[PDB]
PDB file of C-alpha atoms and ligand atoms in Angstrom:
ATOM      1  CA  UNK A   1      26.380  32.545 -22.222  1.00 19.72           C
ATOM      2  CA  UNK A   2      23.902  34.439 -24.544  1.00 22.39           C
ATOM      3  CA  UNK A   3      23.035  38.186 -24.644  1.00 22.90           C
ATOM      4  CA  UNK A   4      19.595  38.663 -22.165  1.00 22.82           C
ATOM      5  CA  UNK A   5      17.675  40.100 -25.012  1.00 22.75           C
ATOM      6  CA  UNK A   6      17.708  36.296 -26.478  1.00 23.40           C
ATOM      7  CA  UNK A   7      14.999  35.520 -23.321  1.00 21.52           C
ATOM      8  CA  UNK A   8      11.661  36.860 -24.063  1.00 19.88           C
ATOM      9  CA  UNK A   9      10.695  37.347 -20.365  1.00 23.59           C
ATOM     10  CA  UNK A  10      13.588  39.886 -20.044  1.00 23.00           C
ATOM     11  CA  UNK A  11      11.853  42.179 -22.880  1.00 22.54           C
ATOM     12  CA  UNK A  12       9.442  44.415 -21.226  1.00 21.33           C
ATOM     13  CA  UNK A  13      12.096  45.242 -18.231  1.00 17.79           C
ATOM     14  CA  UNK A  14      14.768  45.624 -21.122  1.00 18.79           C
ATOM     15  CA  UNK A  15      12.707  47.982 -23.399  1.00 20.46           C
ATOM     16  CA  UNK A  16      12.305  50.414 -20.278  1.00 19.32           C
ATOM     17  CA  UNK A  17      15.857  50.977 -18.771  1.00 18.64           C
ATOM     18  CA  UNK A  18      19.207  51.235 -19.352  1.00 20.54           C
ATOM     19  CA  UNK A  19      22.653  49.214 -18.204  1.00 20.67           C
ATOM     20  CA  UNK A  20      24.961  51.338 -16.505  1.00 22.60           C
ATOM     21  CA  UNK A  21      28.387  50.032 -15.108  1.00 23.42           C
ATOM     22  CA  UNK A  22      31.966  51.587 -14.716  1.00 23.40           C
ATOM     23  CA  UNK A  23      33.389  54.354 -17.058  1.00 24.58           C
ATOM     24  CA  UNK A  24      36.355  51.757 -17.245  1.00 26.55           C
ATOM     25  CA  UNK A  25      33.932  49.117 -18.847  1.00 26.54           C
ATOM     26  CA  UNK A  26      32.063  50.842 -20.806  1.00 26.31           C
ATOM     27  CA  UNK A  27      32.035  54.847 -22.715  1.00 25.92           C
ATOM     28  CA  UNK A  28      27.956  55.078 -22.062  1.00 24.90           C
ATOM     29  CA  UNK A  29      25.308  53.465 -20.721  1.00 23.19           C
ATOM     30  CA  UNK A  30      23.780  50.560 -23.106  1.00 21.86           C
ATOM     31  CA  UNK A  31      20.427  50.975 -24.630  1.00 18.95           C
ATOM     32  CA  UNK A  32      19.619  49.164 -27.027  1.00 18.51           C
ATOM     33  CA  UNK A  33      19.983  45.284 -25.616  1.00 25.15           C
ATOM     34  CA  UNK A  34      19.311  42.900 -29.065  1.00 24.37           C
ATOM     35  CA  UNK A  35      22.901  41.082 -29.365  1.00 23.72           C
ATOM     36  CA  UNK A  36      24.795  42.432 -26.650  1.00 28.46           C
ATOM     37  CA  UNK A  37      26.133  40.428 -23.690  1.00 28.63           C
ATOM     38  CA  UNK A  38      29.453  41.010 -21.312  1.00 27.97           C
ATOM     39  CA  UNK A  39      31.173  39.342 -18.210  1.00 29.52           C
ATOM     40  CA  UNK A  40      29.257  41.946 -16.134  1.00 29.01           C
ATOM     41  CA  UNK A  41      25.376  41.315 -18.119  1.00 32.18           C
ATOM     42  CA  UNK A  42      24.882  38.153 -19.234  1.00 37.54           C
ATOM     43  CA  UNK A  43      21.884  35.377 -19.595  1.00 40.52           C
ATOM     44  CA  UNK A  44      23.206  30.971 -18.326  1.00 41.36           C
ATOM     45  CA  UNK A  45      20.307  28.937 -17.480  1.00 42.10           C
ATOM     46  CA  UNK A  46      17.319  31.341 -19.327  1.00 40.08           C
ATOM     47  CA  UNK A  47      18.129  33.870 -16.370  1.00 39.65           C
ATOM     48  CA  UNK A  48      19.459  38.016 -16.387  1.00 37.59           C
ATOM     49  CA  UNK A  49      22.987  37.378 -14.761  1.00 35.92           C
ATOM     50  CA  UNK A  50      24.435  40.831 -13.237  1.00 39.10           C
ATOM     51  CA  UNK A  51      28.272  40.480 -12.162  1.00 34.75           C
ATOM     52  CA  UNK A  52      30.474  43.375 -10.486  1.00 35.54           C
ATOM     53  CA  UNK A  53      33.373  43.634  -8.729  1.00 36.20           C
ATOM     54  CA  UNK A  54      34.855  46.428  -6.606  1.00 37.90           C
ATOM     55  CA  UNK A  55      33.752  48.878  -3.877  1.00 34.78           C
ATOM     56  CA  UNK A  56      31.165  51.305  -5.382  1.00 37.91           C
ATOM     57  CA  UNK A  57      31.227  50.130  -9.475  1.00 39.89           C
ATOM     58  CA  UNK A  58      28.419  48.586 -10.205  1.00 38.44           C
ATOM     59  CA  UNK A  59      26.504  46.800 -13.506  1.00 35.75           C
ATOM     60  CA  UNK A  60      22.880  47.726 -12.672  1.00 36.54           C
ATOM     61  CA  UNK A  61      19.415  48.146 -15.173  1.00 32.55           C
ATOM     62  CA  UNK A  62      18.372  52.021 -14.732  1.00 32.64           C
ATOM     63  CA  UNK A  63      14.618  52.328 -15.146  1.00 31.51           C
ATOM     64  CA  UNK A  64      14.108  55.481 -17.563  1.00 31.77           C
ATOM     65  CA  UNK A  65      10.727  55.982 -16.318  1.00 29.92           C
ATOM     66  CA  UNK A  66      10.983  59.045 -13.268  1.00 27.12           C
ATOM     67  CA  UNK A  67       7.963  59.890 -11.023  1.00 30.85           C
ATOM     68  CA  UNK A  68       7.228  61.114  -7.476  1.00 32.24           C
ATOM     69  CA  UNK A  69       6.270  59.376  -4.735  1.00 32.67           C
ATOM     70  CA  UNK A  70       2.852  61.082  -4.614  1.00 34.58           C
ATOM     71  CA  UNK A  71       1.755  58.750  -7.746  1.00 34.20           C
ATOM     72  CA  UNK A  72      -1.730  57.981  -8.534  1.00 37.65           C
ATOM     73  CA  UNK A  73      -1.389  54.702  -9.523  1.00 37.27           C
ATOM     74  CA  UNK A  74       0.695  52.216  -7.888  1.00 33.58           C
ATOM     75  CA  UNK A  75       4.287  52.482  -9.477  1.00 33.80           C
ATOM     76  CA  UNK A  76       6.459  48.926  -9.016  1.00 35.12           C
ATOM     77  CA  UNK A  77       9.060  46.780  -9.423  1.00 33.97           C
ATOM     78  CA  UNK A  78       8.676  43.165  -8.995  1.00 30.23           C
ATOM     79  CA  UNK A  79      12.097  40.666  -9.256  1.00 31.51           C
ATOM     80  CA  UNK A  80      12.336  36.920  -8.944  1.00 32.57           C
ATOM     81  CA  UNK A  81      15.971  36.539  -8.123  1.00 32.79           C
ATOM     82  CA  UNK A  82      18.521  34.461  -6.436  1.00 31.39           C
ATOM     83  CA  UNK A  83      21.406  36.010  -4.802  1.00 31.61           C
ATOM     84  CA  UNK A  84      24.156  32.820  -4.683  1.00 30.15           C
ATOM     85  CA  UNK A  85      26.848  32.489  -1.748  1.00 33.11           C
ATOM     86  CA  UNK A  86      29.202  35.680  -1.731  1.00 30.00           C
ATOM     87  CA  UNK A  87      32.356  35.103  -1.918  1.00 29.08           C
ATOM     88  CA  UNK A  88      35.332  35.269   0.625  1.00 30.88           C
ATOM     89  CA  UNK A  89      35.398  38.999   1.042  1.00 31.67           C
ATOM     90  CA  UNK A  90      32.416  40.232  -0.793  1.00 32.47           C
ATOM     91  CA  UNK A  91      30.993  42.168   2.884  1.00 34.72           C
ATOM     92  CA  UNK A  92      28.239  44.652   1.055  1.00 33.04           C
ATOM     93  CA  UNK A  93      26.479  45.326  -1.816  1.00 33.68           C
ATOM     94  CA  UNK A  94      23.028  46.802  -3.278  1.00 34.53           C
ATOM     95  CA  UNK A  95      20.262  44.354  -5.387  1.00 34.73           C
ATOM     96  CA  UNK A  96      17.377  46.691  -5.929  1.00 32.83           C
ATOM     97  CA  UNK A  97      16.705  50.672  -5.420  1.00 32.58           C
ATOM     98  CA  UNK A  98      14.319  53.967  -5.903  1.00 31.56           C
ATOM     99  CA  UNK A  99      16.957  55.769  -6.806  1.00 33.42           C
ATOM    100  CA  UNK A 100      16.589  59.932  -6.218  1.00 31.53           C
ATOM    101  CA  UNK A 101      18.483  60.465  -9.821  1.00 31.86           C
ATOM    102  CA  UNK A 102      19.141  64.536 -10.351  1.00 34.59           C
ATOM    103  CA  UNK A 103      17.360  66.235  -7.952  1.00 33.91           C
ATOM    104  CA  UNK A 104      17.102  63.564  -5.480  1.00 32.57           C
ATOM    105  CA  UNK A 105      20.724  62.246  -5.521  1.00 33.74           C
ATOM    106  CA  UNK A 106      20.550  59.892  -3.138  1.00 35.21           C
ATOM    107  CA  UNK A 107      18.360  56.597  -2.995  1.00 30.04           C
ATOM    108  CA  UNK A 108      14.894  56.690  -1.217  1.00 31.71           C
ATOM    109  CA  UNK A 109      15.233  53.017  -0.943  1.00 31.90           C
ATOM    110  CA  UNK A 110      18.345  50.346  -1.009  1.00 30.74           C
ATOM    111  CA  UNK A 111      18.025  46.723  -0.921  1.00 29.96           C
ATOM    112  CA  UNK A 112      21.206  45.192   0.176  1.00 27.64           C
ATOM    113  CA  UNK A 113      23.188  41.584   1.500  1.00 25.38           C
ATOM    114  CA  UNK A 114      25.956  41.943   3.897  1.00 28.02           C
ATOM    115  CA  UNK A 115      27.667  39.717   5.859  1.00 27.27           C
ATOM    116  CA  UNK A 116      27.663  41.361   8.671  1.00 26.86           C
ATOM    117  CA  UNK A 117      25.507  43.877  10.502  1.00 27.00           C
ATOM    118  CA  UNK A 118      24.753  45.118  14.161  1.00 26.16           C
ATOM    119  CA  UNK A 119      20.549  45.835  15.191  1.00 24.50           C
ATOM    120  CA  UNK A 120      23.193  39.666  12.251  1.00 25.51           C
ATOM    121  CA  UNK A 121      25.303  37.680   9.489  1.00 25.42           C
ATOM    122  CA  UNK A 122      24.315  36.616   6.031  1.00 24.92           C
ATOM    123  CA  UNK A 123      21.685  38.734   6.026  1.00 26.43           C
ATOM    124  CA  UNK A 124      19.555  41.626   4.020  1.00 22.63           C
ATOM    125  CA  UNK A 125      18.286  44.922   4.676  1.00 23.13           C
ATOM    126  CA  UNK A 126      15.986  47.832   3.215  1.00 22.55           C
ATOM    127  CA  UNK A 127      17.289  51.352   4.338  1.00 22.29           C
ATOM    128  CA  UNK A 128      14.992  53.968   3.868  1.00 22.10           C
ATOM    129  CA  UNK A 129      16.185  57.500   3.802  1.00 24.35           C
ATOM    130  CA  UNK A 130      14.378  59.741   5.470  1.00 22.70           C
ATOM    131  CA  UNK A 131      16.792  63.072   4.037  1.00 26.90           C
ATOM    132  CA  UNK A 132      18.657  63.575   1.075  1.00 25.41           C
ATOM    133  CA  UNK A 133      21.686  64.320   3.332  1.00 26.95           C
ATOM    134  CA  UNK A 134      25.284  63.465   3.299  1.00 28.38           C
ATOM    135  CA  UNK A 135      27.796  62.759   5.495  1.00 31.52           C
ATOM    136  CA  UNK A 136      26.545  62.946   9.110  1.00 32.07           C
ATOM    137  CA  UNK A 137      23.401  65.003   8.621  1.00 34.43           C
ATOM    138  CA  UNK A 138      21.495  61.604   6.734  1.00 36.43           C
ATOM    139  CA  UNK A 139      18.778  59.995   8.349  1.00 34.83           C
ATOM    140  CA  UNK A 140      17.367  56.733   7.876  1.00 32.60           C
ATOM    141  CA  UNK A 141      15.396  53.757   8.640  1.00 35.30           C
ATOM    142  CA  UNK A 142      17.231  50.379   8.694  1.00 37.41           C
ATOM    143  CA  UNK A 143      14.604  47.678   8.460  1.00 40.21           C
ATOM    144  CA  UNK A 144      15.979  44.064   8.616  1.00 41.21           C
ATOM    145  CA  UNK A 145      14.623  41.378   6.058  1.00 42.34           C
ATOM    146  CA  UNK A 146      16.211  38.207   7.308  1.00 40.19           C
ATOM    147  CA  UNK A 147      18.756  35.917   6.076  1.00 35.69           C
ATOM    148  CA  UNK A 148      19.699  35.661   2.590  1.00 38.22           C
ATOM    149  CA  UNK A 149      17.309  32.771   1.061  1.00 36.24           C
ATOM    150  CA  UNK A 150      19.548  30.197  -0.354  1.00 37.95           C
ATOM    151  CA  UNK A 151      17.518  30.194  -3.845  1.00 38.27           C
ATOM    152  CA  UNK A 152      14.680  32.169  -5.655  1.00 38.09           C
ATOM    153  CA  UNK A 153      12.870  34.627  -3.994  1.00 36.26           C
ATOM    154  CA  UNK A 154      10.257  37.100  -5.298  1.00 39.07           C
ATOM    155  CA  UNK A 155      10.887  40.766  -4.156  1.00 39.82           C
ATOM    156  CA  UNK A 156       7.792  43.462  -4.964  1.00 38.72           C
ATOM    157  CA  UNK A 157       8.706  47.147  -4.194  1.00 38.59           C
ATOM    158  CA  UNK A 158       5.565  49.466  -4.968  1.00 38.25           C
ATOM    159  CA  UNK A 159       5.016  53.527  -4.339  1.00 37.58           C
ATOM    160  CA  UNK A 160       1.451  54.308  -3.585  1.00 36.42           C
ATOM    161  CA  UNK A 161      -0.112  57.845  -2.830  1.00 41.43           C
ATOM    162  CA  UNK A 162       3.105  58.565  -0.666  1.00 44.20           C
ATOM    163  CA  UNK A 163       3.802  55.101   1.016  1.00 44.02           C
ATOM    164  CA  UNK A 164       6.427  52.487   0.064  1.00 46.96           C
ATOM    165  CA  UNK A 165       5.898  48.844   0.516  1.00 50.18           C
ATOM    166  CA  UNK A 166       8.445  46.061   0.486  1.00 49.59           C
ATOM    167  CA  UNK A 167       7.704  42.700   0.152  1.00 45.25           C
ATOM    168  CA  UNK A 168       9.850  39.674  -0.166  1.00 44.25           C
ATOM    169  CA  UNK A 169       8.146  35.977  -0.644  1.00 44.62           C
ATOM    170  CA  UNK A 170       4.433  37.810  -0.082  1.00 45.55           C
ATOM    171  CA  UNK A 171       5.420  39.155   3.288  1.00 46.83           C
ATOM    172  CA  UNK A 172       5.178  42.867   3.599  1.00 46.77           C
ATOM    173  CA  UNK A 173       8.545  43.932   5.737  1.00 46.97           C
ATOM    174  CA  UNK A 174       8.362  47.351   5.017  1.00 43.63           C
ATOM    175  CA  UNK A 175       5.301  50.078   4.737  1.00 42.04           C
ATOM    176  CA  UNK A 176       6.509  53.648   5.394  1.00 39.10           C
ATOM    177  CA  UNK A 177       5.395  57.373   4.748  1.00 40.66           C
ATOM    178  CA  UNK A 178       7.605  58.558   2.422  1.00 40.54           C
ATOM    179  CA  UNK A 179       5.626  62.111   1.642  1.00 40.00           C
ATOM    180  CA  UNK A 180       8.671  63.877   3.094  1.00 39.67           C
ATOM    181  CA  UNK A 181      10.749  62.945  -0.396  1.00 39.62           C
ATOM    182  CA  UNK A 182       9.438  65.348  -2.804  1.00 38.45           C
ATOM    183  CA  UNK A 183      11.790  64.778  -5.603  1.00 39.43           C
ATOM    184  CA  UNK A 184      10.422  64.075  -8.898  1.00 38.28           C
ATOM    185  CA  UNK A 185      13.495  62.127 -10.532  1.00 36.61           C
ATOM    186  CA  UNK A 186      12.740  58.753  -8.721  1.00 40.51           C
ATOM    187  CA  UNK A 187      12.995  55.597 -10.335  1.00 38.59           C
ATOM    188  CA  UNK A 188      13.993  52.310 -10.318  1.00 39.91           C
ATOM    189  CA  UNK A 189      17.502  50.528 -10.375  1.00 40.15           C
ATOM    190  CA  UNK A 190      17.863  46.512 -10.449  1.00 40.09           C
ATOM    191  CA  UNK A 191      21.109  44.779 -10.515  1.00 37.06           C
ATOM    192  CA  UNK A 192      24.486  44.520  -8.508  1.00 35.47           C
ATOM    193  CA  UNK A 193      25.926  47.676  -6.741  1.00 38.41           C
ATOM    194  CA  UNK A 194      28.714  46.678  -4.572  1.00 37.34           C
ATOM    195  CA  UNK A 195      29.525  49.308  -1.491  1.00 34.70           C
ATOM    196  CA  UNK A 196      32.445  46.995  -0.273  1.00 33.74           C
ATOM    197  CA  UNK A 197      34.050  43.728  -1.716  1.00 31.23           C
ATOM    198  CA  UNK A 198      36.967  43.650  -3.907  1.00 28.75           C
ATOM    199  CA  UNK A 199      35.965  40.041  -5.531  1.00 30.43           C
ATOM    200  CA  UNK A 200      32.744  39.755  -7.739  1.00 28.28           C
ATOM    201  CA  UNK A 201      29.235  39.721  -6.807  1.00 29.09           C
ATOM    202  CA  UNK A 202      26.489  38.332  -9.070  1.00 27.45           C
ATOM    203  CA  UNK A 203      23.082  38.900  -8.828  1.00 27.51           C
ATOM    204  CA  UNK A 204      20.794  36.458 -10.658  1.00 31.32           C
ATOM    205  CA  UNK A 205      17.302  37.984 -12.046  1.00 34.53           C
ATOM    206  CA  UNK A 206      14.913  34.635 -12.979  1.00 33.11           C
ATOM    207  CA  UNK A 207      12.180  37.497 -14.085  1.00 31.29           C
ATOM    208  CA  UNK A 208      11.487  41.538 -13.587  1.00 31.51           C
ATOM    209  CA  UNK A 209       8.680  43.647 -14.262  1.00 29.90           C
ATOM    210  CA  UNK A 210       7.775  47.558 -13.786  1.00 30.41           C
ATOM    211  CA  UNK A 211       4.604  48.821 -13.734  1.00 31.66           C
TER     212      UNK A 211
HETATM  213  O1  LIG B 301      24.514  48.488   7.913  1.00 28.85           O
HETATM  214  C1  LIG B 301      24.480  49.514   8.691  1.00 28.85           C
HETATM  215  O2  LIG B 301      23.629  49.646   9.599  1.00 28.85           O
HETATM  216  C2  LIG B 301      25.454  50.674   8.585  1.00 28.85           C
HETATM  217  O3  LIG B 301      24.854  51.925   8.181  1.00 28.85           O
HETATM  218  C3  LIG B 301      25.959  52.671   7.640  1.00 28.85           C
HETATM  219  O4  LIG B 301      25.596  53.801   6.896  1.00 28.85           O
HETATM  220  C4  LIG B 301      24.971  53.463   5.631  1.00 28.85           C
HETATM  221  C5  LIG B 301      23.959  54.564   5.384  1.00 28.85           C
HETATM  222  O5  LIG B 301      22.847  54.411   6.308  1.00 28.85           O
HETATM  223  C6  LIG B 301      23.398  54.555   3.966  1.00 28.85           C
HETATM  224  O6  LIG B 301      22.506  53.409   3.831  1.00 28.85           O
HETATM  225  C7  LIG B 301      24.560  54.465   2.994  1.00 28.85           C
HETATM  226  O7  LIG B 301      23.987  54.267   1.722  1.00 28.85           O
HETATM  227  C8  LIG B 301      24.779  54.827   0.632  1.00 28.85           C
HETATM  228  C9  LIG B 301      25.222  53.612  -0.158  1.00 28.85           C
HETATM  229  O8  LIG B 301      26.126  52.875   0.664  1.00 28.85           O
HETATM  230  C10 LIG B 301      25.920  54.056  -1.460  1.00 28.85           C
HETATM  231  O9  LIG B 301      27.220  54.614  -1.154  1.00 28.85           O
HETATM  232  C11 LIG B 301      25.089  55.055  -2.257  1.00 28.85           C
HETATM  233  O10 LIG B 301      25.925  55.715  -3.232  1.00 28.85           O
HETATM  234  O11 LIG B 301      24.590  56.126  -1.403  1.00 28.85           O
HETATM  235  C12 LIG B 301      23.833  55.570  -0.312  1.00 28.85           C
HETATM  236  C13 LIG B 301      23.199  56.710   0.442  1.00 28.85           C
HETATM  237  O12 LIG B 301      23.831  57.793   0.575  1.00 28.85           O
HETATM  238  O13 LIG B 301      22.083  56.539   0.925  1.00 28.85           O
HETATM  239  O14 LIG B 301      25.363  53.378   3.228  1.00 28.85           O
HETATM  240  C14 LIG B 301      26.032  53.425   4.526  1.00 28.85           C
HETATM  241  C15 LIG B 301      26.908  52.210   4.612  1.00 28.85           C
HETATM  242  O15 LIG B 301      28.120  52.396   4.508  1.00 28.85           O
HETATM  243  O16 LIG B 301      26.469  51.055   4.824  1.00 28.85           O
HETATM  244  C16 LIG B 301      26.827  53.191   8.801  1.00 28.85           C
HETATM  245  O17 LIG B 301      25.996  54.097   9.587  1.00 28.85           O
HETATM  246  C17 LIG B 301      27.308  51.997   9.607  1.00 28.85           C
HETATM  247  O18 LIG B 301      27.813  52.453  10.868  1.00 28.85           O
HETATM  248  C18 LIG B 301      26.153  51.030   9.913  1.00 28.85           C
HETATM  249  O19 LIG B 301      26.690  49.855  10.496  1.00 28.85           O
END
């Protein structure tokens, strides 16, 4: 293992966020990425390993660029990943995000795997809040993306003049008005964000870009 500065692909992605994870692991979010490397951020193989265990802790890159939804110019993320078998009792857990961050709060978009779903096994989903609601006032959109591909896949996310696209392998699954979400404290999140699943999950980034 090697720290994910050490591949040059990672340095444009790496220049532009943050690594967050649990209060437990670490005092403050890591900036500054030359040298370092940890069981939960690591590179094997020339990849950007993220590995987290535990409902709700995560180990996920922060974006530090914010914007609103009603962007000029096309704002995006674009990952070439491979999310490897869960293990026995891994059930939920988030790969990619617009994240609301202060005034938001909650995520405009999630990109998750679960093993189990009802609208399904093994399978992924974007969820698309259509509120910044909790509890039993939030509203959403559940769009289903299929079953987990069992090795890299390329997944685009992109804000446009008030519509957010989705697509995974070149096939746009998701195009939705999002004009309603007026927060200006959006940005991206890439990584693993488990929501329920004692044992690890690892997320495996072969390349990421914003834009
Ligand atoms: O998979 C389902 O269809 C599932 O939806 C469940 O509620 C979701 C809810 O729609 C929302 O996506 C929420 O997302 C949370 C996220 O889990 C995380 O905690 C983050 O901090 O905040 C997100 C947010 O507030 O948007 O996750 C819920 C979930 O537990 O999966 C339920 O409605 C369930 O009945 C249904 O099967």
């Amino acid at each position: 293992r090697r720290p994910p500065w050490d591949i040059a692909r990672f340095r444009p992605a790496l220049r532009v966020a943050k690594l967050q994870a649990p209060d437990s692991v670490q005092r403050k979010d890591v900036r500054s990425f030359p040298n370092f490397q940890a069981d939960h951020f690591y590179s094997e193989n020339r990849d950007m390993v993220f590995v987290m265990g535990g409902d709700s802790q995560r180990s996920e890159l922060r974006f530090l660029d914010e914007w609103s939804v009603r962007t000029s110019s096309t704002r995006r993320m674009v990952g070439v990943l491979t999310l490897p078998t869960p293990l026995r009792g891994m059930k939920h857990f988030t790969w990619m995000q617009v994240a609301g961050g202060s005034k938001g709060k909650k995520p405009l978009l999630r990109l998750s795997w679960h093993d189990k779903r009802e609208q399904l096994r093994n399978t992924m989903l974007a969820t698309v809040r259509l509120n910044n609601k909790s509890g039993d006032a939030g509203r959403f959109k559940k769009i289903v993306l299929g079953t987990r591909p069992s090795g890299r896949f390329v997944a685009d996310v992109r804000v446009e003049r008030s519509r957010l696209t989705v697509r995974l392998n070149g096939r746009k699954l998701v195009d939705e008005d999002v004009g309603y979400w007026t927060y200006s404290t959006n940005y991206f999140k890439a990584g693993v964000y488990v929501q329920e699943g004692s044992p690890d999950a690892r997320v495996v980034f072969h390349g990421l870009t914003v834009s």
